[PDB]
């Protein structure tokens, strides 16, 4: 009885659901991309989208680019460590990356740099 606010601006509006695959009642959406060299992408960025974008830019930019990530703070603690996915609908490289052990704690990436096909995250 406390998921939906009963007083304020967001009064009566049900919670938002995000997913990388379709579900009953889903609505296909797209992220806004705009190039200025620099490239800007805005919207709700999920980890698979970021990994796919890095994979594409690695080949497109010949393994040389820098990225500045703006994070939503109340979701930074999700990195807290906790310890057959072929049909989940993800690239095998993304599945391999996401099946790791959480190293960061209460902290999120703020700057990613790739030089000569080597990653040096900040």
């Amino acid at each position: 009885k406390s998921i939906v606010a009963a007083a304020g601006l967001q009064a009566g509006l049900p919670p938002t659901l995000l997913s990388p695959v379709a579900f009953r009642g889903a609505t296909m959406h797209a992220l806004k991309a705009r190039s200025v060299f620099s490239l800007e992408i805005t919207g709700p960025i999920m980890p698979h989208s970021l990994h796919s974008l890095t994979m594409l830019l690695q080949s497109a930019q010949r393994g040389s680019f820098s990225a500045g990530l703006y994070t939503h703070e109340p979701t930074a603690v999700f990195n807290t460590p906790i310890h057959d996915l072929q049909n989940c609908g993800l690239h095998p490289c993304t599945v391999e990356q996401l099946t790791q052990v959480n190293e960061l704690g209460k902290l999120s990436l703020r700057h990613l740099e790739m030089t000569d096909y080597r990653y040096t995250w900040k």
């Binding site: 938002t16 997913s19 609505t27 974008l53 497109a60 030089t115």
Partner: protein, 136 residues
Amino acid sequence: GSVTFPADWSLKTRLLFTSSHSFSWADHLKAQEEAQGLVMQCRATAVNLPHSIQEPKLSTDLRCAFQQSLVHWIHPSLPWVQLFPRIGVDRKMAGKNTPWSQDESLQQVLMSEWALSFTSLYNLLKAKLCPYFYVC
């Protein structure tokens, strides 16, 4: 230099890529490229690009993969209301037409649809047909 960066499970809100080379390949996407990207995303097609590309503007696979990577699914479809950032936003939520705030049957209808979508999403997650999903 590590091969891969550590996995981040936080939800970013804006990305800015800077590089010496040109990003103009990811602009003026043709209709065919967008349609192919949407279809590829809906049908779970894996794209393996070559090690290096010297003419990105003439590569259809790269642009189709870009359009595929720019697709996600959100349950509530209200085009005139901001929906992703729900914690600590009130300047962008001020002065909007919200009929559900006062009417109650409409709120009950929205709640029932949300419950059905949530149940379907959990059932998809259980059968390993969906990696993860966020509830905000």
